[PDB]
User: What shape does this take?
Amino acid sequence: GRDALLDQIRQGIQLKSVA
Amino acid sequence: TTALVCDNGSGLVKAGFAGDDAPRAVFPSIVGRPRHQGVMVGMGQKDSYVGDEAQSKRGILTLKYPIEHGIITNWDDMEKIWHHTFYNELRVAPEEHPTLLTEAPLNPKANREKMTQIMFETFNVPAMYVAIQAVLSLYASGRTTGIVLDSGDGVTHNVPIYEGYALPHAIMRLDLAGRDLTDYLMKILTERGYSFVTTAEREIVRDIKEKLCYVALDFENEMATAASSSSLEKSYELPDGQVITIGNERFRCPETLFQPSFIGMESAGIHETTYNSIMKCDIDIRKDLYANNVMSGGTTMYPGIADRMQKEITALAPSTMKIKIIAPPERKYSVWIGGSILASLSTFQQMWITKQEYDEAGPSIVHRKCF
Ligand SMILES: Nc1ncnc2c1ncn2[C@@H]1O[C@H](COP(=O)(O)OP(=O)(O)OP(=O)(O)O)[C@@H](O)[C@H]1O
Ligand SMILES: [Ca+2]
Assistant: This one.
């Protein structure tokens, strides 16, 4: 089930800003 | 209940919390110890100093770099960095934070394990992981395939990657990067007449470099045009109101990456070392690589390096080939971002190495979990 790990790295995420 | 991401640079430690868009702290990967006893007296019982705190207190100290060319070498000093990081930079308790670490490409089996050990046994983390400094950079751009050019302060690595794994058989290293460049910049400036000796002027040639340097498309053109008309000059003001002026030194400094012959390196020019790699690969895939060339690391920040990589990897590859150089604006904190990203993933939780997993299998576990 690592394939879904790239399925994700591809799709993306939303990192919280700072400062 | 959040995780920690620490990115080891042989020049800078970049650490922060997973889930955030940039390292909260970044500092000098150094360890300063008193040159002799007379310096320990007033110490007030503390042993060493680290990062910026080890800078300003230079004379009394003996600085050492725990990381050489990317690979950790002075362990006990890497243990002192890590500490300072966790407690002094992030202000967190290792013991209660998962932690994503980065290993340079071709990280030694032992270095991988040694590092593991220290994290769980010395720092007692709840769980931790290790990622190849390069792969993250790629991931940070949303790619699970491509060939990454990691160029920091100490080392320059060319990395090909298919469906997640790197291809250690096609890894191309180059012991020429930042420090070196900054340093040449000096040689060429000194030749110019200026005088950069003190350790202070060194940090001046770095700032200088950092802010007035780029990568020419047609070198001998910009070279010829640089000495025929003053049109390409710029001037820099030092701390005491004194001004210097950088001539062609502007692109003669970064030119090295493409011409290691400058500083005396029989090694191949990065442009080449990049081609040379896409070639060490299975015929049917390079196709994708040639197109997904992605850059990371402080030294690939020189402007016009992408516009120059095109120019070269292009002319070396097939007439029909399609090349596309991916150079992200924050290509500096690329590596770190990856780890952040990686760690904030759901499909990733199931992949950490837990304190309790480390106790029945030992540290040789690094090879079965971190692929
Ligand atoms: N805009 C810029 N142009 C050129 N060089 C730059 C720029 N910004 C930073 N640098 C140089 O990048 C280097 C730092 O790069 P990076 O942060 O990738 O290094 P690192 O991780 O410490 O090294 P390594 O890859 O050996 O671990 C320094 O030499 C720094 O002066
Ligand atoms: Ca690095």
Remarks:
- Chain B has 16 helices and 19 strands.
